[PDB]
A paper describes a structure:
These transport systems rely on a high-affinity periplasmic binding protein (PBP) to impart ligand specificity. A comparison of the [name] and PtxB structures showed that sequence differences within the binding pocket essentially eliminate an oxygen binding site in [name], providing specificity for a ligand with two oxygen atoms (hypophosphite), over one with three (phosphite).
To probe the role of the D206 in ligand binding we generated [name] and D206N mutants of [name]. MST assays show that in the presence of 20 mM acetate the [name] mutant binds hypophosphite at both pH 7.4 and pH 5, but with a ca. 5000 × reduction in binding affinity compared to the WT protein in the same conditions. All of the atoms of the acetate molecule lie in plane of the guanidinium group of the arginine, forming a classic end-on salt bridge interaction. This differs from the direction of approach of the aspartate to the arginine in the WT complex, where the two oxygen atoms of the aspartate lie 1 Å below the plane of the guanidinium group, with the Cα-Cβ bond of D206 offset by approximately 75° from the same plane. The mode of binding of the hypophosphite and the degree of domain closure is the same as the WT protein (RMSD Cα: 0.19 Å), but the binding of the acetate slightly disrupts the local packing around the binding pocket, causing a change in rotamer conformation of M18. However, the observation of acetate binding to facilitate the formation of the buried salt bridge in the closed complex of [name] [name], suggests that this intramolecular interaction is a prerequisite for capture of the ligand.
Numbering used by the authors: 2 to 63, 64C, 65 to 157, 158C, 159 to 242, 242A, 242B, 243 to 262
Write the structure that this text describes.
């Protein structure tokens, strides 16, 4: 962050919460514009296609305020001391769940013991719900996805849902709040898929700043976001996202723990 020609400038970044960067920016830029306006700041914004990429951007000093996925925040905190200021609310709650979605007609009565050799697609290794949590689940039951499934990694949630719907894979990861938004936007036909597995509750996205971020600004940003009403917040964000709660590192313990156990 710097003051340019007397005017504060902020660099924003948004994780790939919606299926494409343009959708993500169109739907969530307004909360960032609001934030910048409360500070009298200019801004710039990007939304990378992968979850790992926004973590790396924050770690490598390119981002003043980032909306990071949980594992992206934990990784960046470990590497660079990135600080979480607040957690986003979805339907009024600072949590969400990971999914494994399957084709609607997939036999699953003995899941996942009846799924050997099926085509499973996980997301990039920076994706909490899309990679970290499902990998932790398989490892907890002694399954190595790369040798158990016809396995692919690195897909986006948009690719996973599309490929399931069109019969190109059997199984793919998603997150509940993400799937909800895709159904609400008419982007998938939910008759063609079903939830096969859901995780326990996970902490939601981490509104994050670099380690040495200006303390006065940090405090203002936190108050600006957390003081929003549900109605005002929702007016500025994609459907379902409707506020922020003050957060700290220990709120992400379950994610840190999962990452540790996977090495």
């Amino acid at each position: 962050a710097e003051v340019v020609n007397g005017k504060l400038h902020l660099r924003f970044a948004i994780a790939p919460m919606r299926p494409t960067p343009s959708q993500t920016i169109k739907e969530f830029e307004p909360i960032f514009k609001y934030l910048a306006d409360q500070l009298g700041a200019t801004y710039e914004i990007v939304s990378p296609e992968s979850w790992a990429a926004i973590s790396v951007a924050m770690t490598n000093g390119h981002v003043d305020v980032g909306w990071l996925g949980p594992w992206g925040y934990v990784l960046s905190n470990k590497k660079a001391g990135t600080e979480v200021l607040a957690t986003v609310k979805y339907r009024g709650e600072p949590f969400y769940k990971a999914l494994i979605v399957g084709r609607a007609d997939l036999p699953i009565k003995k899941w996942p013991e009846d799924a050997k050799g099926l085509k499973l697609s996980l997301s990039d290794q920076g994706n909490t719900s899309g990679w970290l949590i499902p990998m932790a689940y398989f490892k907890s039951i002694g399954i190595d996805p790369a040798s158990y499934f016809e396995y692919r990694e690195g897909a986006t949630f948009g690719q996973n849902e599309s490929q399931i719907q069109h019969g190109l894979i059997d199984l793919g990861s998603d997150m509940d709040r993400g799937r909800n938004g895709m159904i609400e936007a008419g982007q998938i036909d939910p008759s063609k898929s079903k939830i096969v597995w859901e995780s326990s509750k996970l902490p939601n996205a981490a509104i994050s700043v670099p380690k040495d971020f200006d303390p006065a600004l940090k405090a203002r940003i936190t108050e600006i976001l957390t003081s929003l009403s549900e109605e005002k917040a929702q007016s500025l964000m994609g459907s379902g996202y409707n506020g922020f709660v003050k957060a700290k590192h220990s709120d992400y313990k379950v994610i840190e723990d999962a990452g540790r156990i996977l090495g």
